C-alpha cells in the first residue's frame, strides 16, 4: 500500500464535548494506504497564525522530500482552511497531492461529517491523477483546487464552493474523477519558497467598507505600521471619495494598496477608479483573505507596483 | 392612470460617458403610470451617507402620506443598495410599494440593463399585490424583499440574490407574480420611525477577520468612540482567542458587540463562544453591512443587549 | 409532550448492507415528542405509485383529525419525494404540521445523514409556527414549503433546493426559524380533497424534447388514451413545428396539452406559443413531475382549459 | 486583423417583432475583427436537426483548414445550443477556436442582450489563449466549455451554467481570462470525424420518469426501432421495478441502455442497480440530451457495452 502522512492540526473534525482517535475510529482506511500519523498542533483554526503555518510547511515539505511519502493530508478547522489551502499552493514545492479536509459537525454528533469526508481525502491523496495538480481541498464528496474554494456558508455541511470557477472534480466513497486542470501558477511553479521567508512576515491588514464609510480605521492600519492594506470594496472595488483621497496619500508614501470587494465572487477591475494613476492594485478575483495571503508573500520581494500586479495576474 | 413618485438619488442607471434623461428614454413608462420625478442627489452609492439616507427617507415618507400617491420607485447605484433598502424597511410607515432598481452596466453600454429594470420596477410599484410587502428591491426579472438581498458578484447583471431564503416573486416584461411573504417586521409594524431620529445616529464600525489576526483595528474602533461594532467574525463569528478578550473587556466597558460572519450567508449562533457569559449579541443571518444598520438604529432606542438581541429575532 | 404520528413508506433512510429500527437509533426523540410509529409501506421510491399515494394520505388525514395528534412525519425515499410532496399539499386538509423527510445516504453509511435529519424533523413538526404553511420537507437543516422543493443532483446530501423561491426557513439541531410563508394555495384552501377522488387519477404522461425531436413518442401516448399531456420543452416550453401540428390536432381532439420545461428552472409563458389560439395550458413554474400531479387532479374536476389554467395560477 | 467566420443559424440573437443585420447593429466589432459572415440556415434552434448540424459541421470544418481563418463564431438559438454545442466538440478536428453565442431577449427588446454577447464571443475568438480548449459557448459575461454547459431557466439572461463544475473563464467588455482547461476530449483528440459519418444518425429516444411511472413509451420506443435508449431516470438513475425488467430484456435484445437523471446535475453510479449484470451504460455527469448526442455517435462505430461504457469516461 502507498504511504499517506498525516497532518493534524485541531479543528471541528477533532472537535467533541487529536491523532488518533482518528483512524482509530476509521479502520477502513488501513485497506487504502499506510498512515504516517503527527501532530503539528491542536488548535480551532480561528487561533491559527503564521507561526503555525511555517511550522506545517516545514513539515509538509520535508515529507514531500521523502521518496517513501506518496501524498500528504492534512486535517484542518474550516474557519481559516481557504487561508491555509492557499498559502500552501504557493509554498510548497512538489507534484505530489496535498488535501486538506475538515469537518462541520463536530465527531460526537449525530450524522456527524468528518468520517467519510476523511475517508475521500486519503482516497484523492492516493490516485496518481491527484498529481500536479497544485494544492487540494476535499470536503462533501467534492475536490477544489485551494486559489478557488471559499466557506460561503456558517453552518451547512457544503459551505465550501468555488463561486468563480466550480470543483475541478468529484469524489464518491473513494471513486475520484477530474474534469478540469487549475491555470493559475501553484507549488513548482511558484516564484516562492520558504528557504526565503521569514517570520513575520510583512504586516496586512483588510479593511471594510460599508455605506457612510469613513477613513479612521484605514488610518490606524497606517498609523500600526502596515505594509500593505487590502480594501474589501464595494461592488467593484468601490470607496467613498474621502476614503479614496486616503488611499491615494498612502500609496504616495510607499504603502501598498490593493483593491479587492467584500461582495464575495467576480474580479474587480480598473473602471470607476483608474488604478494606474495612482499606484493602486487589483485583487483580481481572490477575495480579501486570499488576496491579503498573496500580498503579504508579494512584499517578501519587492514593493514594485507594477511586479505585484503582474503577481496577481499569475497566481 | 395610477401616479408614481420617481425619487432618483444616482448611480449607474445614471451612469454615462439624472431625472430625465430616464423616462425621456423610455416613452412606454407614460402606459403603465403617470410619473412624478425629482432629484433627491446625484451621487454614486459608494458616497452614499446618513444625511442622504435622512433627506431621502423624509422626502418617500411625505410622498407616501400623500393621497395621490400609488407608490414610490428609487434608482439607485447598486453598490449599497442593499443597505439603503434595509433602512428605509425599518423606518417607513406605510403599506404602499416601495421599490428600489438599479443597474450593472452604463446607460451608454452596449446590451445596458438599466431600461428594462426601471420599466419592471415600475409595473412593479403599481400592482396591487405589492403592497403590504415592506420594501422591495427589482433588478433582472427578479423581486426581492429588502432584508434578505444582496449583492453577491463585481460585474454581472445578475449579481443581486436572497442567499439565505430567495426571490419572494417574478416580474417579466412588466407582468408581476408573487409567491412568498416576509414575516420579519417591517414598515408599519416597525418600532423605528423618522420623527424620533436624529443625525448623526451612533457611530457603529466593522472589523474584518482572518488567520493571524489581531485585535488592533478593534481597539482603534474604541478609541474612536465607537458605541457598537459589528465582527465579520470566521465561520460561525469566530474569533482568535486574543480577540475574544478585547471584545469581553469592551462589553464590561458598555460597548455592544455583535458577531457576525464574513462568510455570506446563514445564521450565526452560540456554540463556540458563550454569548450570554459575556453579553454579545448575534446577528442572525445578516450580513455585517446590514446588522450594522439595525444596531444604529437600536441604540438610538436602548444599550439593553437583551432588547437588542430580540430585535435581530424580530427585524 | 406532544405525539408526533410518523409513517414510514421506505427510503434511503431506512436502506442498509422499518419502524424501529430509527426510534431505536435515536433515543434522544424521546425528550421532545411522543411518537407513533407505523408503517405504511416499505419500498423504494422509485416505486411509489398511486395505490400507496392513496393509503398514505388517507391515513395521514385520519390521524391530523384525531385531536391527541399534534402532526405528523412520513419517513420517504428522496428520489419522489417531491411528487408525494405536492400531492399531499393538495389533498390533505389541515392546518397542523405535515413533515416529510428522507437520507441521501444508507443508514449504514460513514457520516449517514438520516438520524440528524429525522431529529429536525421531529422538531419542526412540535413546533407552534410550522402551523398553517402546507406540507412542509425538511431536509440538510432546512425547512422548504412542498409546491417549490426539487432534488437537483443525483448524491449530494444538500441536493433539496427550492430553485424559483427558496427555503421558507432553517432548523439547527432542532433550533427552528421561519423567515418567509408560502401564497400558493395548499391544504385547507385547496378544493381536492379525498373523499372526491378515486384510483386509477386520469393517465397522464410526460414527453421529453430534444435536438431532433419527432412525435411518434407523442402519438403513442395519445394511442395509449392519455387524457393530459405534459411536454418537458426546451427553453421557454418550446417544440419543433412538426410537434407543434401534432399538441394542436391532440388538443381539438380533447386531450390537455401542459406546457412545462426540461431546463428545471423559471415560468414557461406564452410568447414564441400562442398558447389561446390552440389551447394549450402553461404550467407557470413547475417541473414536468410536479406539473403531472397538478393536472392528474385536475382532470377529476373538469376538462375545460380555462379553469385548469386558472388552477396552475392559483397552486 | 484576424479574420473570423461568423456563421448564423438563427435563434432569439436574430429574432424581432440574419446577417447582416447584427454586424450592421454593432460598428464596434470592425475594431477587432475582419468578419467572413454567412448564413447556414435560419431557424429557432426548437427546429435544430441533424441534416442542419451536419450542413454546420462541414461548413465549420471547411473555414478552420483554411489557413486565411483564425477562428469560428456561430450564432445559435439558446434552446438546444447545449446540443449543438456538444455535437461540434466531438466531430470538429482543429485547435482554432470555435465559439457559440445566442442571446435571452429579442433583439427589439429594452435591454436586448445580443450586442454585448456577440461583441465578447468574437474577442474570445480572437485571442490566442482560446485555443486547444475544445468548443466553447460565451453568453453573459462568461466562458464556458461545451461539455459542461446547460441552459437552467426558462427566461434569465444568466441562464447558462455548469452546474457539475464551473465556467472555465470570464470576459468582460472585450477582457478574456481562462483559470481552467478541460480534461475530457475533444475535437482533435476525438475518434469522431465528419468524414466517418452519415445521415441518419441512429435512432435515440429519451424516455422520462415519476411517481407511477410504467414502461408503455419505452416499448413504444423499441417499437419505433430504436438504437438506442436514454432513461432520464429519479435520482441517481432509478427506475420501478416494472421498468427495470423492460430495460433487462432490451438489453438482451441488443438495444443499448443509457441510464441518465432527469434532476439536472451529478454523476450516475451502479449502486441500487447492477449495470454489468445487465448490460446497461451508465451516462457519467452527462444529463440526457447530451447522454444522447455521445450515444448516437457511439452508435455508429459499435455496439459493445464495454466500448461504449469507456467513451461515456473519456468524452
Ligand atoms: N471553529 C472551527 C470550525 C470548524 O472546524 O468547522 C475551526 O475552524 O476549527
Ligand atoms: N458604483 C456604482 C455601481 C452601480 O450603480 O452599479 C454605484 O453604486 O453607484
Ligand atoms: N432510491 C432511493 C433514494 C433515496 O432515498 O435517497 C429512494 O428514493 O427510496
Ligand atoms: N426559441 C429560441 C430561444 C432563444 O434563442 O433564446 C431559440 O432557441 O431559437
Same mark, same amino acid.
Given at each position: 500500500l502507498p504511504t499517506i502522512a498525516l497532518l493534524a492540526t485541531g479543528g471541528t473534525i477533532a472537535g467533541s464535548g487529536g491523532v488518533k482517535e482518528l483512524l482509530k475510529a476509521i479502520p477502513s482506511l488501513n485497506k487504502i494506504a499506510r498512515i504516517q500519523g503527527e501532530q503539528v498542533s491542536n488548535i480551532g483554526s480561528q487561533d491559527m497564525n503564521e507561526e503555525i503555518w511555517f511550522k506545517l510547511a516545514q513539515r509538509a515539505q520535508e515529507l514531500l522530500d521523502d521518496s517513501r511519502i506518496q501524498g500528504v493530508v492534512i486535517t484542518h478547522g474550516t474557519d481559516t482552511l481557504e487561508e491555509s489551502a492557499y498559502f500552501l499552493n504557493l509554498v510548497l514545492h512538489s507534484t505530489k497531492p496535498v488535501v486538506l479536509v475538515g469537518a462541520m459537525r463536530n465527531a460526537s454528533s449525530l450524522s456527524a461529517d468528518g468520517a467519510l469526508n476523511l475517508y475521500e481525502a486519503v482516497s484523492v491523496a492516493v490516485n496518481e491523477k491527484s498529481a500536479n495538480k497544485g494544492v487540494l481541498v476535499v470536503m462533501d464528496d467534492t475536490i477544489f483546487s485551494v486559489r478557488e474554494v471559499v466557506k460561503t456558508? !456558517? !453552518?451547512?455541511? @457544503?459551505? &465550501?464552493?468555488?463561486?468563480?470557477s466550480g470543483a475541478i472534480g468529484s469524489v464518491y466513497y473513494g471513486k475520484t474523477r477530474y474534469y478540469m486542470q487549475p491555470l493559475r501558477k501553484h507549488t !513548482? $511553479? @511558484? $516564484? &516562492?519558497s520558504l528557504s526565503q521567508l521569514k517570520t513575520p512576515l510583512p504586516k496586512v491588514d483588510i479593511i471594510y467598507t460599508h455605506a457612510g464609510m469613513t477613513p479612521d480605521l484605514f488610518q490606524a492600519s497606517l498609523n500600526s505600521h502596515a505594509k500593505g492594506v487590502v480594501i474589501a470594496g464595494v461592488g467593484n472595488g468601490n470607496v467613498s471619495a474621502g476614503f479614496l483621497k486616503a488611499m491615494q496619500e498612502a500609496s504616495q508614501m510607499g504603502v501598498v494598496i490593493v483593491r479587492s470587494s467584500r461582495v464575495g465572487s467576480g474580479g474587480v477591475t480598473s473602471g470607476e477608479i483608474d488604478d494606474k494613476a495612482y499606484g493602486f492594485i487589483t485583487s483580481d478575483n481572490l477575495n480579501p483573505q486570499k488576496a491579503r495571503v498573496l500580498l503579504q508573500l508579494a512584499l517578501t520581494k519587492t514593493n514594485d507596483k507594477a511586479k505585484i500586479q503582474e503577481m496577481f495576474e499569475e497566481y
Open positions: 456558508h !456558517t !453552518t451547512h455541511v @457544503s459551505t &465550501f464552493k468555488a463561486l468563480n !513548482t $511553479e @511558484s $516564484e &516562492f
